[PDB]
Amino acid sequence: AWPKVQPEVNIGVVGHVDHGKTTLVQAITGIWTSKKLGYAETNIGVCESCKKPEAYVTEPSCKSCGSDDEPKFLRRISFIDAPGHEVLMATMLSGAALMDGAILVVAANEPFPQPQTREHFVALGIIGVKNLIIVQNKVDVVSKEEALSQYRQIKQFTKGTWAENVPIIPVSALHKINIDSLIEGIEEYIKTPYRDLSQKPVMLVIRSFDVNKPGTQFNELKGGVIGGSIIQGLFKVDQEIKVLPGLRVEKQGKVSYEPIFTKISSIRFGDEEFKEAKPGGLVAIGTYLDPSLTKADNLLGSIITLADAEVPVLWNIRIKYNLLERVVGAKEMLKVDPIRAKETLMLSVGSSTTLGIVTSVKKDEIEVELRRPVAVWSNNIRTVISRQIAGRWRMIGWGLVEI
Numbered sequence: 001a002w003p004k005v006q007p008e009v010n011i012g013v014v015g016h017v018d019h020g021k022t023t024l025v026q027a028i029t030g031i032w033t034s035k036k037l038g039y040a041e042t043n044i045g046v047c048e049s050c051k052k053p054e055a056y057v058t059e060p061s062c063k064s065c066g067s068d069d070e071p072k073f074l075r076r077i078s079f080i081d082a083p084g085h086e087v088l089m090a091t092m093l094s095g096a097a098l099m100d101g102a103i104l105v106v107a108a109n110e111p112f113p114q115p116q117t118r119e120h121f122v123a124l125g126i127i128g129v130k131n132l133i134i135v136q137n138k139v140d141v142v143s144k145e146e147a148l149s150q151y152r153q154i155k156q157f158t159k160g161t162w163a164e165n166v167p168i169i170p171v172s173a174l175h176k177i178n179i180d181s182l183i184e185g186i187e188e189y190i191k192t193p194y195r196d197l198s199q200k201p202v203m204l205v206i207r208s209f210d211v212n213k214p215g216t217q218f219n220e221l222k223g224g225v226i227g228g229s230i231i232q233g234l235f236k237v238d239q240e241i242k243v244l245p246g247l248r249v250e251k252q253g254k255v256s257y258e259p260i261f262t263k264i265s266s267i268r269f270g271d272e273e274f275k276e277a278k279p280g281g282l283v284a285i286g287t288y289l290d291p292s293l294t295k296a297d298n299l300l301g302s303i304i305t306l307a308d309a310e311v312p313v314l315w316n317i318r319i320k321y322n323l324l325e326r327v328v329g330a331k332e333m334l335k336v337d338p339i340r341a342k343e344t345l346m347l348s349v350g351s352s353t354t355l356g357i358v359t360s361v362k363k364d365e366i367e368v369e370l371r372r373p374v375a376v377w378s379n380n381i382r383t384v385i386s387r388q389i390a391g392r393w394r395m396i397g398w399g400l401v402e403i
């Protein structure tokens with residue numbers, strides 16, 4: 001039989017709106033995600049006596065290649081399925097903090113390169129998600145020749161960049177054509193990365209829930225649940241933890257943040273319970289928190305650490321930055337203006353998104369006064385910088401948060 005384990009690697013799925021990311025995740029895992037930032041898992045295996053790529057399977061059967069033998073289990077994987085709409089760029093960025101590698105979906109029946117094909121690509125590059133596969137989707141509605149013309153364009157686009165040798169795999173997500181080749185590619189190009197389990201446990205929070213059905217009395221009201229991904233170390237049932245920056249507190253119209261202390265009462269990945277949670281996959285951490293504290297993704301953008309961890313929670317930050325030449329996600333070409341004092345920027349840090357006012361500009365460094373504080377769990381954390389342009393938040397640069 002195949003073991004029941006947590007996913008060991010997160011594969012982002014990104015690309016322009018409606019290019020078919022969610023359908024692709026469904027073709028691979030059998031699961032349709034409904035959430036804004038979607039999540040789905042599957043086991044991956046290989047029928048060792050069969051020919052590749054058909055030998056790759058997502059279920060323990062080799063019947064499709066004529067064997068009654070069980071396929072060799074390789075690993076469980078999971079997908080972080082980002083939204084494509086330009087208005088949802090921040091969500092993509094938050095999801096990108098959880099990715100170990102990625103698939104960039106390009107619709108074969110739309111002119112390449114579309115605005116969020118570019119914006120998501122560049123974001124992946126900046127964030128360091130470079131174990132990339134480019135998937136040419138919807139090849140079912142175009143001829144081989146049209147798809148090949150676009151392939152040439154994609155090679156031209158990636159040439160001279162970090163992605164110059166990234167593979168391009170043509171599929172139909174909708175009608176499930178050539179999916180096996182994509183599985184083979186995932187195994188070849190998106191290896192599970194090394195995890196130093198000795199590092200202090202840190203989890204980035206992207207969801208939080210009240211899991212109680214209506215008509216539940218207090219006597220059995222379950223404690224709040226917090227969802228996200230472990231980016232380093234590992235957590236275990238009964239650990240004393242804290243959520244940072246924590247809870248927004250109002251004292252006569254004055255607003256501050258207080259760390260939320262709690263205890264891990266349960267750990268789930270998908271439909272399975274575990275005693276510990278490691279990087280890879282999206283974990284649900286059960287706590288003893290009042291469910292009102294976690295309801296409706298209240299804690300999105302928080303981090304979780306062990307209760308005694310030392311973590312700066314900052315209302316002001318210094319960033320060693322670099323700007324892009326052009327606003328890549330804009331429809332009409334546009335140069336990136338230099339950062340100016342007093343302007344409001346949007347900062348993506350881990351899973352968090354925060355507005356701040358620029359209080360100092362230098363050539364390599366800016367200082368920013370944050371509208372709400374950010375937990376900075378390490379010394380070399382990358383931030384992605386967006387500017388509001390014609391009413392839309394567009395990525396214009398990035399930086400390292402300086403401690």
Ligand SMILES: Nc1nc2c(ncn2[C@@H]2O[C@H](COP(=O)(O)OP(=O)(O)CP(=O)(O)O)[C@@H](O)[C@H]2O)c(=O)[nH]1
Binds near residue numbers: 018083084
């Ligand atoms: N012909 C064809 N249509 C496809 C294929 N994959 C997806 N589609 C269609 O494209 C549309 C968008 O699919 P969807 O999976 O929601 O794309 P998405 O990128 O996740 C949408 P969003 O960017 O908002 O997350 C759907 O109508 C879907 O049926 C394909 O391989 N071939």
Ligand SMILES: Nc1nc2c(ncn2[C@@H]2O[C@H](COP(=O)(O)OP(=O)(O)CP(=O)(O)O)[C@@H](O)[C@H]2O)c(=O)[nH]1
Binds near residue numbers: 211268
């Ligand atoms: N660790 C742990 N996780 C739980 C527990 N109960 C539910 N979860 C997790 O919390 C999440 C929310 O589950 P639930 O609210 O029951 O289903 P849902 O309504 O589809 C979630 P949403 O409200 O976002 O649509 C799920 O990922 C589930 O695995 C629990 O007792 N312990």
Ligand SMILES: [Mg+2]
Binds near residue numbers: 021081082083
């Ligand atoms: Mg989608």
Ligand code: NA
Binds near residue numbers: 030058059
């Ligand atoms: Na599966």
Ligand code: NA
Binds near residue numbers: 053054
């Ligand atoms: Na197969």
Ligand code: NA
Binds near residue numbers: 096099100
């Ligand atoms: Na990563």
Ligand code: NA
Binds near residue numbers: 156157158159160161
């Ligand atoms: Na190029």
Ligand code: NA
Binds near residue numbers: 157
């Ligand atoms: Na170029």
Ligand code: NA
């Ligand atoms: Na360029």
Ligand code: NA
Binds near residue numbers: 099231
């Ligand atoms: Na990481």
Ligand code: NA
Binds near residue numbers: 311312
């Ligand atoms: Na602190």
Ligand code: NA
Binds near residue numbers: 315316
């Ligand atoms: Na301050």
